[PDB]
Amino acid sequence: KKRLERKYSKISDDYSSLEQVTEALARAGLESSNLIVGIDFTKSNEWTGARSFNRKSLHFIGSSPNPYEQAITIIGRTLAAFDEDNLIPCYGFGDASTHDQDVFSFNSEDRFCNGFEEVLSRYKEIVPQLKLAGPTSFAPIIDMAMTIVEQSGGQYHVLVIIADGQVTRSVDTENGQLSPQEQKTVDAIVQASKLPLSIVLVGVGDGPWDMMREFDDNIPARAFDNFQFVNFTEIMAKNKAQSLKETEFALSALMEIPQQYKATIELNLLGRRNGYIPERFPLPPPM
């Protein structure tokens, strides 16, 4: 077990096209996957639109779609295939109703969204009724994903977190001493490597991204690299045509999935219950 974890320590970008990954996924023997979506409704979204979204809030409802609406739309166009039943569990976190402690379900009895159509539909209905708040932690959304996976009896899931990457940090700490939010988020990423769960951070807005890269590349304590960072605004910024960016997004999202899936098998997680994952209950959507 010691040697198999240092085999899956860090996962580089080992694929230059979507086709290479699609093939690597076949060769890996991936037959069934499900998506979970988490959306950052923290107040940082108010100022992380400075350069990338014209001094507006990333959650601003205008005449054209905001980076959250864009990401939901492009995830639906590129990854909807990887949810086998097209029912998407969708959760908000970091509004006044949840802060850094909970998540809320997009629909009432934690009814899953009917495709990315309803994820987008509901995002629009929900965000104007929210108070963007904080602090910012991924612990609750990762716990929610862990609970979904555990209750499924270890079915492979991909948690897609759309976020501005601004997790609460000690602005003056000189060494690498961690905020409570960082610490709990890291503990959650570590806990989640006991389960057949892949995480993909779809970054929107200006960054900075130092911490999302830390989560991507450098968490020694975890059983396998279960975290990919995708700079979605860097990709959409580029000069090339729309469909050529959609492809680059898809490649970047799926980049770590082949080795991650293999890890769930080699580490004896796929189709197993861990047994000791405390059940998390999502709050209802704000009304």
Nearest to 141 by CA among 167, 104, 166, 170: 104
- Binder of residue 166, out of Ca ion, Mg ion, none (CB less than 5 to 8 A by kind): Mg ion
The CB-of-80 to Ca ion minimum distance in angstroms stands at 10
The CB-of-13 to Mg ion minimum distance in angstroms stands at 27
The CB-of-168 to Mg ion minimum distance in angstroms stands at 7
Burial 247-265 (b: 16+ CB within 10 A, else e): bbbbbbbbbbbbbbbbbbe
Per-residue string for binding with Ca ion, 94-113, x by CB under 5 A? --------------------
- Binder of residue 150, out of Ca ion, Mg ion, none (CB less than 5 to 8 A by kind): none
Distance, CA of 149 to CA of 145 (rounded, Å): 6
- Binding residues for Mg ion restricted to 5-34, rule: CB under 5 A: none
Dump the DSSP string for the chain.
-HHHHHHSS------SSHHHHHHHHHHHT----EEEEEEE-BGGGGTTTTTTTTTS-TT---SS--HHHHHHHHHHHHTGGGSTTSEE-EEEESBTTTTTT--EESSTTSPPEEHHHHHHHHHHHHGGG--BB----SHHHHHHHHHHHHHTTS--EEEEEEE-------TT-SSSPPPHHHHHHHHHHHHHTTSSEEEEEEE-SS---HHHHHHHH--TTSSS--EEEEEHHHHHHSSS-HHHHHHHHHHHHHTTHHHHHHHHHHTT-TT---S--PPP-PBPPP-
Q: Does 225 interact with Ca ion (rule: CB under 5 A)?
A: yes
The CB-of-267 to Ca ion minimum distance in angstroms stands at 16
The CB-of-70 to Ca ion minimum distance in angstroms stands at 21
The CB-of-94 to Mg ion minimum distance in angstroms stands at 6
- How many chain residues bind Mg ion (CB under 5 A)? 4
Stretch that binds Ca ion, among 70-78, 171-179, 214-222, 265-273 (CB under 5 A): 214-222
- How many chain residues bind Ca ion (CB under 5 A)? 8
Give residue number: closest CB to Ca ion: 34
Interface with Ca ion (CB under 5 A), residue from 40, 69, 110, 216:
216
Interface with Mg ion (CB under 5 A), residue from 57, 97, 166, 252:
166
- Binder of residue 182, out of Ca ion, Mg ion, none (CB less than 5 to 8 A by kind): none
The CB-of-188 to Mg ion minimum distance in angstroms stands at 16
Q: Does 136 interact with Mg ion (rule: CB under 5 A)?
A: yes
Distance, CA of 186 to CA of 219 (rounded, Å): 8
Q: Does 42 interact with Mg ion (rule: CB under 5 A)?
A: yes
Q: Does 220 interact with Ca ion (rule: CB under 5 A)?
A: no
Interface with Ca ion (CB under 5 A), residue from 2, 6, 64, 85:
85
* Contacting positions for Mg ion (CB under 5 A): 42, 44, 136, 166
* Contacting positions for Ca ion (CB under 5 A): 34, 83, 85, 87, 216, 225, 227-228
